[PDB]
Design a protein around this ligand. Structure first.
Ligand code: U2O
Ligand code: ZN
Ligand code: ZN
Length: 341
């Protein structure tokens, strides 16, 4: 059964609601981005209109084999009409192709659905500027003040510097980056760029990246593993055992692995600083867990909400317990009282 926060009242619209079979009276299924917790249910057998970004549609066609006649890509930052309702897609600053959706309801109500997003001040100079928003469907993944983490730029700075130093000190070192789905591509792209190398990866991951409209991507990635000194592996293989096995392959070409495990928030964030992160080490293998987030920190979320001044907030994450729902409402009221809306 499709939960309430996935329906747009007054429309035939659902958002990220593909695992509930046919939704009665849904005329258009919006997909904010291509992460499995959101497209769960979509497959080659889906027979209803799917509205999404261009990049999301490339992945639907190529990775899930959805039929083109059901894929409706929409440009960003453009007033479009879907089943008689004006809609706009806005960059969510999440993973490639991820959008927020603005709905202009016939009764004059305006709804912003953030999908998943990492709130940024640049969003305050999008089409949202001076737009009254009556309801906000808010990605509340990290809606609590202990969720602090550095900017994405700071994490990439640390990763680039760490990789460049280890490979400059040891030209026979190999850099490995773990990946689980799309997003966070800058970690391995930026490392490879500073090392003057391409990124080696499986055919399946190569295929996925070829859907992301990344400029000059053919110059950056390859399936030729052993011509590259940055390798991508499934996130589950980023452990001493999995990396020891990866070191045997490619035949005594490398004598050291430095590996990066991009996480979200972890408890050691409210304790250490990004410059102070140290790896787990076993022999010639080191594993760095780096807090690269594509979700808003608490402070980023609070700033965006206080700027937008929505009349009502519907959280879309952490809604499962009485404690989590009421804590989030308490923060929403605090923000409203502090900002005056
Ligand atoms: C804790 C942080 C986010 N939480 C989360 N993240 C993901 C994938 C990430 C990449 C995403 O941003 N997805 O939208 C999940 C994937 C599945 Cl399959 C199930 C639960 C999931 N929870
Ligand atoms: Zn996501
Ligand atoms: Zn998500």
């Amino acid at each position: 059964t499709c939960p309430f926060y996935k329906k747009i009242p007054g429309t035939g619209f659902t958002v990220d609601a593909f695992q509930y079979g046919v939704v009665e009276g849904c005329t258009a299924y919006f997909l904010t981005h291509f992460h499995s917790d959101h497209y769960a249910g979509l497959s080659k057998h889906f027979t209803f209109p799917v509205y999404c970004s261009e990049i999301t549609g490339n992945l639907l066609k190529n990775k899930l084999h959805v039929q083109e006649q059901y894929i409706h890509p929409l440009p960003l930052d453009t007033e479009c009409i879907v089943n008689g309702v004006k809609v706009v897609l806005l960059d969510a600053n999440h993973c490639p192709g991820a959008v927020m959706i603005l709905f202009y309801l016939p009764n004059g109500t305006v709804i912003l659905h953030t999908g998943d997003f990492r709130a940024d001040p640049s969003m305050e100079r999008s089409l949202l500027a001076d737009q009254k928003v009556h309801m906000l469907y808010l990605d509340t993944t990290y809606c609590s003040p202990e969720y602090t983490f550095p900017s994405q730029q700071e994490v990439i700075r640390f990763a680039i510097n760490t990789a460049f130093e280890a490979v400059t000190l040891n030209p026979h070192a190999l850099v490995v980056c773990g990946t689980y789905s799309i997003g966070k591509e800058k970690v391995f792209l930026a490392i490879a760029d500073v090392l003057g190398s391409k990124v080696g990866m499986s055919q399946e991951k190569y295929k996925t990246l070829q859907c992301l409209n990344i400029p000059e991507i053919n110059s950056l990635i390859t399936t030729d593993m052993c011509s590259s000194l940055v390798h991508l592996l499934p996130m589950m293989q980023i452990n001493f055992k999995g990396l020891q096995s990866h070191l045997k392959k490619c035949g005594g070409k490398y004598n050291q692995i430095l590996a990066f495990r991009p996480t979200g928030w972890t408890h050691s964030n409210k304790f250490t600083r990004i410059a102070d992160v140290i790896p787990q080490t076993k022999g010639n293998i080191s594993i760095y867990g780096i807090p690269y987030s594509e979700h808003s920190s608490y402070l980023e979320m609070k700033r965006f909400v206080q700027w937008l001044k929505p009349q009502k907030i519907i959280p879309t994450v952490n809604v499962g317990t009485w404690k989590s729902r009421s804590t989030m409402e308490k923060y929403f009221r605090e923000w409203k009282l502090e900002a005056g809306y």
